[PDB]
Structures are given as C-alpha cells and as structure tokens.
Design a protein around this nucleic acid. Structure first.
Ligand SMILES: C[C@@H]1C[C@@H]([C@H](O)CC2CC(=O)NC(=O)C2)C(=O)[C@@H](C)C1
Ligand SMILES: [Mg+2]
Ligand SMILES: [Mg+2]
Ligand SMILES: [Mg+2]
Ligand SMILES: [Mg+2]
Ligand SMILES: [Mg+2]
Ligand SMILES: [Mg+2]
Ligand SMILES: [Mg+2]
Ligand SMILES: [Mg+2]
Ligand SMILES: [Mg+2]
Ligand SMILES: [Mg+2]
Ligand SMILES: [Mg+2]
Ligand SMILES: [Mg+2]
Ligand SMILES: [Mg+2]
Ligand SMILES: [Mg+2]
Ligand SMILES: [Mg+2]
Ligand SMILES: [Mg+2]
Ligand SMILES: [Mg+2]
Ligand SMILES: [Mg+2]
Ligand SMILES: [Mg+2]
Ligand SMILES: [Mg+2]
Ligand SMILES: [Mg+2]
Ligand SMILES: [Mg+2]
Ligand SMILES: [Mg+2]
Ligand SMILES: [Mg+2]
Ligand SMILES: [Mg+2]
Ligand SMILES: [Mg+2]
Ligand SMILES: [Mg+2]
Ligand SMILES: [Mg+2]
Ligand SMILES: [Mg+2]
Ligand SMILES: [Mg+2]
Ligand SMILES: [Mg+2]
Ligand SMILES: [Mg+2]
Ligand SMILES: [Mg+2]
Ligand SMILES: [Mg+2]
Ligand SMILES: [Mg+2]
Ligand SMILES: [Mg+2]
Ligand SMILES: [Mg+2]
Ligand SMILES: [Mg+2]
Ligand SMILES: [Mg+2]
Ligand SMILES: [Mg+2]
Ligand SMILES: [Mg+2]
Ligand SMILES: [Mg+2]
Ligand SMILES: [Mg+2]
Ligand SMILES: [Mg+2]
Ligand SMILES: [Mg+2]
Ligand SMILES: [Mg+2]
Ligand SMILES: [Mg+2]
Ligand SMILES: [Mg+2]
Ligand SMILES: [Mg+2]
Ligand SMILES: [Mg+2]
Ligand SMILES: [Mg+2]
Ligand SMILES: [Mg+2]
Ligand SMILES: [Mg+2]
Ligand SMILES: [Mg+2]
Ligand SMILES: [Mg+2]
Ligand SMILES: [Mg+2]
Ligand SMILES: [Mg+2]
Ligand SMILES: [Mg+2]
Ligand SMILES: [Mg+2]
Ligand SMILES: [Mg+2]
Ligand SMILES: [Mg+2]
Ligand SMILES: [Mg+2]
Ligand SMILES: [Mg+2]
Ligand SMILES: [Mg+2]
Ligand SMILES: [Mg+2]
Ligand SMILES: [Zn+2]
Lengths: 50, 98, 251
RNA sequence: UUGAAACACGGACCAAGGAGUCUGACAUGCGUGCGAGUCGACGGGUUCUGAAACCUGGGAUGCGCAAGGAAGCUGACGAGC
RNA sequence: UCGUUCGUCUGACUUGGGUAUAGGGGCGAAAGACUAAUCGAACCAUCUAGUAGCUGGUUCCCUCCGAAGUUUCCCUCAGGA
RNA sequence: AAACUUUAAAUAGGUAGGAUGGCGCGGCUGCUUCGGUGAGCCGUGCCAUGGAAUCGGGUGCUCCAAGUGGGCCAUUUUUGGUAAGCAGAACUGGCGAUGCGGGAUGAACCGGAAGCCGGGUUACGGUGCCCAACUGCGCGCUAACCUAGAACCCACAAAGG
RNA sequence: GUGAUUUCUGCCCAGUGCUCUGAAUGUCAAAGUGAAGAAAUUCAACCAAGCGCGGGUAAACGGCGGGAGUAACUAUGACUC
RNA sequence: CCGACUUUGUGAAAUGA
RNA sequence: GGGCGGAAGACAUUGUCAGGUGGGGAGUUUGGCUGGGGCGGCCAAUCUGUUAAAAGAUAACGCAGGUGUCCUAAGAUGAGCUCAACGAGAACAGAAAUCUCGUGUGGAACAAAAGGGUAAAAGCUCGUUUGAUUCUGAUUUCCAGUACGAAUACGAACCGUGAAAGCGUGGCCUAUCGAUCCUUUAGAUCUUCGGAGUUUGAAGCUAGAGGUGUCAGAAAAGUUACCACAGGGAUUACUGGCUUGUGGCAGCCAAGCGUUCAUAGCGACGUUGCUUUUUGAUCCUUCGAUGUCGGCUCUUCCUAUCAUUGCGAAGCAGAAUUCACCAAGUGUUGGAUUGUUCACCCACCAAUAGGGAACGUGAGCUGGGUUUAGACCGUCGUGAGACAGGUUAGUUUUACCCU
RNA sequence: AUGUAAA
RNA sequence: AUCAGAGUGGCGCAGCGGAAGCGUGGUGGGCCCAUAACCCACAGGUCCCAGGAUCGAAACCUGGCUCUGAUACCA
C-alpha cells in the first residue's frame, strides 16, 4: 500500500534485449546548429562553384 | 529596490533603433472596461439563474508581483516596457546608496 | 428538516377551533335608526355559559324595530346582569351597568366593555372575562374618544363607538391554580388542539431549531428577528429585552 | 493473487438459455475498380419472377488536384551531392 | 406468539363507526416514533438497460512468437495517458 | 570521521583500432588573415593486402496495435530499525509465466529448462531397509548413565567450564 | 425556557445574537437629475432599506483568572503586593 | 424589509430651481 | 334632494424591476502522501552535503540544512590595492580606539543555506556607467529526450567600459517560480467589422503583466452512534506466524556485603544467553464474517517445584528457615470488595507455586463489562455532534449431517 | 491610624 | 508523548536592535514623643546556561534547562 515504488531492476534487461540502438553513422554529416558565420560562407561558395 | 528615473536602453521605433534616453514610470493596470467581449460574454452568462458560473479565485499564494517599467524615450514619445524580478518594496529615483 | 409545529398550525388540519357546543357569535346588535337616535328596550332571558369562553353570555330578547318578531341577540355578560333585567340600547340609554351607549355618552372615567372599533362592528375590545376599558378623555372637535384598553394601551376610537357599561363577568377566573394536567386538558379540549406543548429543546434537529445535541440546550441566541422566514421564527420573537422584568420596564 | 490444495471466495447434480455485438466519424494493414481523377450515394427512364437489375446526370456534389496567413491578401520562376 | 409474574382500572381511561391531514408532506405527552410486516423521507410506474476508476463470469482445437510491476505527468497511488 | 582528506585501489565508465582514409593538381567564398594566410567546400587523378582476437545476417526503416504499470526470493554492496519471514535502494539471476531430477515435505537452494518414442552416458544427490546403487576397499577420532550424530539455504545455540 | 411545594436565583452587555434612535458631512442599487459627446457612452452630484457609529437587553446564546509574600515553636494564612 | 415605475386622478401653500 | 351607511384615501394595494436579510429551503464540496486512518509534518515546487556502493541514474515520514527573498548596486567594466591573524612599537591609550614596519596560500570577503571557485581577483576603494537592451532560433539541465524555470554558445543590431586586447544578453556557479480562457498594457502612421465610405467602439497580430505555493495549474466546511452502497485482508482492532527492544527466567567475572572470610547466602560495575503467558514492531492468512473480556464447567498437558517421598549444602546445636538435586505421581481451598484477569485482605491448610491448549472452553451457559439505536451529567464544539470520562435500560438463532 | 510583657 | 508559553531588580511584570524600566520592596534623611502613613533624595540587576550572525542583543534564530498550558480518537 506504499504507493511510492522505484527500482531499475529489469530495466537493463529491457534495454539490452533489443540492443542499445546506435544511430547509423552518416556520410555527409548534418550541419544544423553549426556556426551561422561558417555556414553562410559554406553555402555561398557552393553557390559560386563552376 | 531602487531604479533610476531616466535610463538609456534600446528604442525599437523605426525612427530611433538606437540607445536613447528613456523616462521611467511604473506599470499600473488600466481600469477594467465594460464593453470588452469577455465582459459582455460574462455579463450575459452571469445573468439569469444558476449563480456564479465562471470560477472565482480564492487560494492566493503569492505576496509579490513582477514590476513592469513603462520606459518612454524622449525622442519619439513611444513607450516600451520591461518587467523586473519580483520585489516587495520598489521606488524610482530613491536616494542613492552610500 | 421538516415542517415545524409552529408552521403546521396554519393548515387547519387538526388545529381548527373546537366549536361544536359554542352558542354562536357574542356581539352587539346591528346598529340601526332606532339605536342611532333613541333607545330600544330589551330584556335578558338567560345567562348561559358559553363553552370555550370564560365570560357568560346573556340572551337578550329585543323586539324587532320594524318587523313583527323577536330578536334573540346574545351579549357578553357584564358583571351585574341578571335575568329579567331590562337592558336598553341606543344613545339616550341611561348610564346603567348593562346598557350599551355610544362613547359620546359615557362620561370620562367610566368603565366600559365590548368596545366597538368601527361604528357597528359590534364589540372588539374588553371582552374576555373580567376586563374593561376606561374612557379617559373626549375630543369633540374631531368626534373621537380615548380609552385605556386592558393591555395598558391607549386607543383613540370614534366617539360613536358603542360600549356596554360595567365590566365583563367571570373576572378573577385565572387566579385559581388548575393543579392538574387533567384540568388543563379539559380546558383545552373545548378551545383548540394546543396542549400538551413539547419543549423544542427535547426535539430532534429535523423538526425544531432548538433540537438535538448530547445535552439539551438551544445552542444559539433564542431571540429571533422579526423578518426571519416562517419556520425560523420560533423562540422569543423580536424581543426588546429578556430576563426577569424589574423596575420601570415592568410597568 | 508476489504466493491456492488451502483454515480465501463460487461450485449438490443434470438439461436447455447465457456474455466484445450493431451503428456514425477516423486511422493503419490488405484486396478489388478506375487512376489526376474518382465517386451515380439524392433524383429520373426503365424493369412482365423482382423493394432486384440496367441506363442516365457532374460543366465543377464530396474528397483530391496548392499552400501560407489571424485577416486584408499572396500563391510554388523548374535540383545538386 | 405462549406460560406463570406484573402496570392501570372513574380516570389526561378503554373502545366501534363516520370524518379531517398524503410524502420533503402528514401526525407526533418527542422514541426520528407512526404513515398497511416497508420510514434518518412509504408504495407504484416511468426517465432506465441510470452511472461505477469496484467484485464476479467472459463458451472450440493445433501451431508459432511471447512480456510487465519500470521512467514522466494527472485531486494522482484500486485508475488512466 | 557518511555530511574530513594529501595519497588512493579492484570491479564498473568513455573513445580509437582505416575503404565514411590520405596526397597531388585547379577552382569558389559574401568567412579568415598583414598576406595563398587559413578554414572549408568543389572538380579531377592517383594510391591505400582490408589495418588487433573472436563471433554473426541485421531494428536497417516504418506502420498498427495488445497486455503491463500491486511484485516477490536469493549471493554480494547498503539506509531505518534492537531485530523481523520488516520497510527502502544498487548489479545480476530466478519465481511470477516452468515443467523435470535432488534437498523427506517447500515458487524462486543445488542440477537443469522440455515435441512424441527406442538405445547409451551423466549433472545435483546418493549405495543399511523403506529406495535404484557397496552392509565395498582403506586410515583415524567419538562411547554420549541429556533423545550422541548424521545435507548449501535449513529449521539455531552463546559467554564460559 | 424551567418543570409541584419550601428556599433562592450572585457578577458580566466586551464576544454572538435581538432591539431602539437617526442631527447628519461614513458606506450605499435601479430609477430619476446635470455636464461632455455627432451618438453609443462616460462622468459627477443626489441616493431608500441594510451595514457602520450610538444606547438596552443574560429566567437571550453564553462566561465567571493567575503569581508571590505573611501570625512570636511548626504548620496554615485572617493581612499585604 | 425597502426604493422607483404602475393602477394614479383633483388643487393649495411653503421651500428649490 | 338621482349617493345604501360608514372609515381610510389617491396613501395602502395589485403588476415589474432594483438593493439588504434569508440553513427557513435547494444544490454541491469537504485534496494527496502516510509503516491502518486521524491529528502531526510537507518528505507535492525546490537547493546544497551525505546515504548513493570512485562514470550516469538511484528510494524511504533517512540524515544536516535552505528557498518563495535582497540588490541601480550587492549588475557591467577599467584602474589601483591585499584579506583573517600574528610579532614588535607609538601622548592620554589598557585585552580591545588610531598610526608604522615585518610575516602572512588565504586560515578573510564574496547579501542569504551548504558545497565548489578566486589573491596585480571573483575580495577592498575609486573612475565612467546601464548588456538587468532588441529579434528569432540552437543546445544543455528535467526529460516522454515534452513544456516551464534556469543556464550556455553563436548569429543580426545598437551600446557600455578600457589606451587596447577583450569583457558585458543581470548577481562567482549550483535554488529564488507560473499553462488555456479572461482583463490590462506596449507596437505598426498594420488587418476586420463582410453593401461603399467618413468616425467613436469592438475583435485581431507580436511581446509583456494580473495566478493558480495542491506549485503540468477544480471555484468548495463539518458531522453521523440513525447511517446506505461498490469493494478491500492492496488496510486496522482478535488468533496464529517471523522478531523479542519491553516482560519473565538462568549463567560467567568478582568490587564489596556476609562482626575476621569474594563465592553459606548474596553479588554492584560489565557481560552471555534462554523463553514466548505481556507489550512493542510488522501487516503474512482471514473483511461474499473464524462470534471479541470475564466468570461458571470439565479435561488434558508443561516445569521455570509451593507443598508432599528420598537426598546434598549452611553463617544446619534442637525447632524453624535459606540454596540446590532426580523428580510433574498427588495436591493447590472457603470467602468480603471489583464486571474484572490482575490486586488486596480474613480463615483454614502440608501448601494455598507458576503455566498452555485459537490469550482452551458462547449451536456449553451468563451478558456483569464492552460493542448499535433511548436517556443523563462533566469537559470540548457556535452547531449537527465527540470523549481511550462516569451512569442507567438494552434479542444470545440451528445440529436431524460427517467424524 | 496606632502606643512597655520588662512592675 | 509531542505542540506551544514564560523565564528580565528582593517580589510580580514592562519591553519594536541607540543598550533597563513599571508598581512594590531596600537604603539616608525630614514631619512625629515614637512607629506607620506622607515628603525629599540614594543604590539596582550574571536581561534562564552555551553559540552564531548582526553598524549593534536581553529581543533573530539554534543548541542546554525548569515550570505552565494544550490535543492524545475508531476498535
Ligand atoms: C484573477 C485572474 C484569475 C485567472 C483566470 O481568470 C481564471 C480563469 C482561467 C481558467 O482556467 N478558466 C476560467 O474560467 C478561470 C487568471 O488568469 C489569473 C492571471 C488572475
Ligand atoms: Mg507502483
Ligand atoms: Mg437577475
Ligand atoms: Mg395534542
Ligand atoms: Mg407550558
Ligand atoms: Mg414544556
Ligand atoms: Mg431526543
Ligand atoms: Mg434545522
Ligand atoms: Mg438542540
Ligand atoms: Mg456550550
Ligand atoms: Mg494477499
Ligand atoms: Mg491453512
Ligand atoms: Mg471465509
Ligand atoms: Mg470476494
Ligand atoms: Mg456454496
Ligand atoms: Mg447451450
Ligand atoms: Mg468532380
Ligand atoms: Mg541521388
Ligand atoms: Mg404474555
Ligand atoms: Mg369513544
Ligand atoms: Mg375511536
Ligand atoms: Mg410499518
Ligand atoms: Mg449492462
Ligand atoms: Mg440497473
Ligand atoms: Mg494504459
Ligand atoms: Mg593516504
Ligand atoms: Mg557506480
Ligand atoms: Mg576504459
Ligand atoms: Mg535412457
Ligand atoms: Mg536397493
Ligand atoms: Mg433559560
Ligand atoms: Mg422533565
Ligand atoms: Mg442567572
Ligand atoms: Mg451586545
Ligand atoms: Mg458580552
Ligand atoms: Mg445609482
Ligand atoms: Mg440609509
Ligand atoms: Mg443544506
Ligand atoms: Mg451530497
Ligand atoms: Mg487519503
Ligand atoms: Mg499512520
Ligand atoms: Mg503536481
Ligand atoms: Mg555517481
Ligand atoms: Mg582589476
Ligand atoms: Mg527545453
Ligand atoms: Mg557579445
Ligand atoms: Mg558581483
Ligand atoms: Mg484577450
Ligand atoms: Mg455588415
Ligand atoms: Mg502570465
Ligand atoms: Mg459516528
Ligand atoms: Mg437519537
Ligand atoms: Mg494482507
Ligand atoms: Mg527477550
Ligand atoms: Mg529483558
Ligand atoms: Mg492485519
Ligand atoms: Mg474479516
Ligand atoms: Mg467456529
Ligand atoms: Mg527439573
Ligand atoms: Mg463451540
Ligand atoms: Mg448489558
Ligand atoms: Mg446508546
Ligand atoms: Mg459515553
Ligand atoms: Mg496594631
Ligand atoms: Mg527610611
Ligand atoms: Mg515614621
Ligand atoms: Zn524612440
């Protein structure tokens, strides 16, 4: 009747039975959040490639 | 907490857009108006039988408010307003600390 | 709660007046020309005990003023009346115990009973056993008079209101202790269902504002306001004061 | 129910009745028809066993084909690693 | 309800019949008593298959996969997302 | 010395171990620098014996949805409690959901997880009778005139003679 | 409300309640009044009952304290603060 | 309980406009 | 004389609005956690240290504490200086007033709680100030990788200070706070009022404030013994079970008592246990019911032995008495008072020892107590009512089944 | 307010 | 058992950080033959024990104590 309960018992099992899903490493890694001063330049060069 | 009467901050008006000199005041809630849509709705709803229909607040807990400072720049006569942290005593242009 | 006895008495259910053996309305005569402007001679025939009323009634057999028949009227006996007496009605009736005169004809200081209030409403003040009204004073510029009622109040009445001179019989009756719940019961059968009367403090809350509690007590001020809704106005109504009456307040 | 053979509850026995259905909106999955269209659903004509079937209208009925705005309003200038 | 034993018995006594008051109403020498074996709000029918986060039941076979009592929020801890 | 620390373990934590790598050439920039200076990108050409062991198809991507959200026991770390078959946590496993062999009997102690059969061999535990297997081969101690003593948990014994 | 007879009903009107008075310059609705307004409207003045101010009322509901010292044996405390 | 409007007419004075 | 006779008289009164009163009446509410619940407390928001087992996460009504503030400086920055303390000295002047020199790793201060950080500073004094500003995103912390709070790092402005580098989007860092609807405010020389306009009003858009502390945010007091329902052994009071602090019972040591003599008989200071008739603790079974104190009756069992049979010891001369041994075969009473178990007295006795069996024993009784509804007092409550205060009256159902 | 017991 | 309250002059009580008084008692005089009473002056305290902050405590808060008062229920 003690409504406060807490364990991590069985939580490693639930985590690992379907693996700890690592994200697929990526060619062309994402730029979102990067330094806008760096990204404006980076975009503008690709604007003026030949 | 003391705050100066006149302060230099940013004035966003398309005429100023720079730090100007702003006179300070204290925000006080203007008076409730009898023709606001919420008021003609509530006055329609309260009318009749059934008594108090919209809830009315009783369990007050705060003792202090957030001051709002109504800063008017001396350059285009347009206000802009800033809320400061919660305080009990508040005074504009008090005698400076020594 | 539920409806409270003070509220149940207005229904008429069992609280009506127990009037099966009462001898009829005890009142004066229908005021007419003869008794406006002279006197009519009537003779008492019997002093009959009226059930449910302490004052005896006197059967008075007038002669009808303008048709050929008797009129058995029925008065409230003034202490002194006897069978065979001639009672005279009118304005020029001599000031004799038993005669009925308008107040324009009772000298100041005189005792009267059965005083009318609107000339011809046939007697309303000073009627119960052994009570009388004294004509204090007259005012002929408005044609009115003043009387001291039994209650100690002082009422201006029309100077043409009639009155029976004397005092009502049966006086001194409420001096005798009844000594018995039996006597009390036989008193109240013939008046109305108003006895035995239960203390509110010994009631449950659902039927009396004083009700309930592990001890018997009222629990709140027993003096209630004049406007309190029916069913709340029980206790001492609109009381100006309480406690034993001492000094001037006992006047 | 964490724990039932329980000193936990229901149950004497048999027969029959007896409990996730039907409807409106939506959603994913699948099948079928057609496919920038698709729906014929309310109506009309016909129907010789027929409350069925079959035909008809739509050139704007619904959904879709165009979105952003609170509203005035504006509305996709043609892709590279 | 029965038995022996008890209270009262000219009295505010006992009782028949007629009649009055019918439900948040009646009546009460007051116990929330009595109002047809029903009264701290009768009975009857209807709204009504009222609602229940609670208890009980929830009916055929084989095959294969097959857990949770843990995080976070909720007048939330017998519940739900 | 839990709310002290110079020092400072063990177990446990993170990252890297190449084809998602480098070097040349010639181009862009609205960034950067005193500046072809850098930063990055862009096009192209070259290389790069696969860059410790072992193992092996993958949640790789998504949709719809069920039940659950009362836990309990054990070895070890551990908080309150005098302690509890008590209350609360940490790592893992078990029971719950699971039979089967052993511990006489037991949900979670020991062995071990399973289609239905024939044959062989074992684990835990045992070989005096119940009861399948030795009254086997050896060596010591105990003699209990108290119910000697006789299974991991486990059904206790203490200070002391 | 108390509950025959006898005897007697001490103190408190600050609390709660009841009740009485309104000089009037506290508070106070609709209506009606004036001003501004182009009008909706806003404003101000006026403004009843009620409260608020002021008296009474306990056989109205109710209530009725502490702390120290002191007698020429001790104790106790007539007395005192 | 109280105020205003209403049924609600007729005319007289005193203070206010 | 076209008045039936009076009384009041355009006031009462009818009708409708308007204000106050209105448990007389209606409706409803009366939070959660909790070693039952109530009361207490806030362990509901939330910070620091520890528990937290050397990454992270980690609970309890665990421990020690904090917060709902304060601040135009106690914010920004630049310059300059060194703080607590200690040694020696100096008129009045001393332990302590002010001054000077030396040493001074921070033993000071930094608004507050604790922890961390700092010595040409983050501290002290002075200088100029307002970055405590504007727009909208990102990221972390919580975490569902949602919101909020807070914080960080860029971007585009405008600025402060410094000669400059730079620093600066509030306080040295870690807590100091607020959703929807509504009202109110700021802004564009913005949009709509849908017949077109002028022109007040109203709604909009973006950003603020007014607050929900039960702090992801209902608008809300009690009582019930007259009570009702759906349920619960997720949860109390009886029994039993684990535990045994508390209760009872026994050892070891030996400082002393025992007139000289620790141990005849004790045995403090400590300490080791045993038991499960009390109570505490828990909440495992039982809430679609296990009949709940006591007495009466009857039986059985235990030994931790009071008496009785045999013995040992003595501070045993005889009598009595005390300690222990195998011993549980036999015995253990009549009564006053109390509902009592317990207790206490009177008397007899060889003795009036202690204990269990669902605190043995209610289809065995009794119903005194307790534990419904009546009623009374005392305290509490404004009250309906409460009392682990005293009082009085208060139904005791079935066996014929199996053993 | 008051006035040795000590003659 | 917890929750509060108050501890201040010999006594009973005031007290809002600059910090000690009210009534009564004590002391020396005066009036009196004398004592009161009265008149004029005089001395007062470990602000319950140990801390902390705090320009600055007796007060704010925290530990150590004594007396007093409260709520201690359903079984
Ligand atoms: C006094 C006001 C009250 C409150 C708000 O009006 C209550 C409303 C909000 C809601 O949830 N719906 C309602 O009908 C009640 C609010 O906004 C605060 C800032 C301050
Ligand atoms: Mg849970
Ligand atoms: Mg209305
Ligand atoms: Mg009667
Ligand atoms: Mg009477
Ligand atoms: Mg009476
Ligand atoms: Mg009663
Ligand atoms: Mg009532
Ligand atoms: Mg009562
Ligand atoms: Mg009372
Ligand atoms: Mg269970
Ligand atoms: Mg069992
Ligand atoms: Mg059962
Ligand atoms: Mg059940
Ligand atoms: Mg059955
Ligand atoms: Mg069937
Ligand atoms: Mg179409
Ligand atoms: Mg491609
Ligand atoms: Mg009988
Ligand atoms: Mg009769
Ligand atoms: Mg009859
Ligand atoms: Mg009946
Ligand atoms: Mg159904
Ligand atoms: Mg039903
Ligand atoms: Mg769910
Ligand atoms: Mg070391
Ligand atoms: Mg770790
Ligand atoms: Mg490593
Ligand atoms: Mg085999
Ligand atoms: Mg064999
Ligand atoms: Mg009285
Ligand atoms: Mg009586
Ligand atoms: Mg009295
Ligand atoms: Mg009064
Ligand atoms: Mg009073
Ligand atoms: Mg008005
Ligand atoms: Mg008035
Ligand atoms: Mg009510
Ligand atoms: Mg209700
Ligand atoms: Mg609760
Ligand atoms: Mg509790
Ligand atoms: Mg919450
Ligand atoms: Mg850690
Ligand atoms: Mg500096
Ligand atoms: Mg976020
Ligand atoms: Mg910057
Ligand atoms: Mg600072
Ligand atoms: Mg709004
Ligand atoms: Mg229009
Ligand atoms: Mg807000
Ligand atoms: Mg109750
Ligand atoms: Mg009752
Ligand atoms: Mg249980
Ligand atoms: Mg023990
Ligand atoms: Mg003990
Ligand atoms: Mg239990
Ligand atoms: Mg039960
Ligand atoms: Mg039984
Ligand atoms: Mg023995
Ligand atoms: Mg039995
Ligand atoms: Mg009884
Ligand atoms: Mg009772
Ligand atoms: Mg009682
Ligand atoms: Mg004297
Ligand atoms: Mg003197
Ligand atoms: Mg003297
Ligand atoms: Zn400006």
């Amino acid at each position: 009747a003690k409504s406060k309960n807490h364990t991590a018992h069985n939580q490693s099992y639930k985590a690992h039975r379907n693996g700890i899903k690592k994200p697929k490493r990526q060619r062309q890694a994402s730029t979102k959040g990067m330094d806008p001063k760096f990204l404006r330049n980076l975009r503008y060069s690709r604007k003026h490639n030949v | 907490v003391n705050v100066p009467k006149t302060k230099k901050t940013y004035c966003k008006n398309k005429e100023c857009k720079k730090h100007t000199l702003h006179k300070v005041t204290q925000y006080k809630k203007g008076k409730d108006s009898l023709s606001a849509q919420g008021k003609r709705r509530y006055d329609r709803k309260q009318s009749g039988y059934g008594g108090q229909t919209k809830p009315v607040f009783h369990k007050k807990a705060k003792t202090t408010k957030k001051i709002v400072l109504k800063l008017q720049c001396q350059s285009c006569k347009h206000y802009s307003q800033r809320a400061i942290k919660r305080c009990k005593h508040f005074e504009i242009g008090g005698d400076k600390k020594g | 709660g539920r409806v409270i006895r003070a509220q149940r008495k207005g229904a008429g259910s069992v609280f009506k007046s127990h009037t099966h053996h009462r001898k009829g309305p005890a009142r004066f005569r229908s005021l007419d020309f003869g008794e406006r402007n002279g006197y009519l001679k009537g003779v008492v025939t019997d002093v009959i005990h009226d059930p449910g009323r302490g004052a005896p009634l006197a059967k008075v057999t007038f002669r009808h003023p303008f048709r050929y028949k008797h009129q058995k009227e029925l008065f409230v006996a003034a202490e002194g009346m006897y069978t065979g007496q001639f009672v005279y009605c009118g304005r020029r009736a001599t000031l004799s115990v038993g005669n009925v005169l308008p107040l324009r004809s009772v000298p100041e200081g005189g005792v009267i009973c059965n005083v009318e209030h609107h000339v011809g409403d046939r007697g309303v003040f000073a009627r119960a056993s052994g009570d009388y009204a004294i004509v204090i004073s007259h005012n002929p510029d408005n044609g009115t008079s003043r009387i001291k009622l039994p209650s100690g109040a002082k009422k201006i009445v029309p100077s043409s209101c009639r009155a029976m001179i004397g005092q009502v019989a049966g006086g001194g009756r409420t001096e005798k202790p009844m000594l018995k719940a039996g006597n009390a019961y036989h008193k109240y059968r013939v008046k109305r269902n108003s006895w035995p009367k239960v203390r509110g403090v010994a009631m449950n809350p659902v039927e009396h504002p004083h009700g309930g509690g592990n001890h018997q007590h009222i629990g709140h001020a027993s003096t209630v306001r004049r406007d309190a809704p029916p069913g709340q106005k029980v206790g001492l109504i609109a009381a100006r004061r309480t406690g034993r009456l001492r000094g001037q307040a006992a006047a």
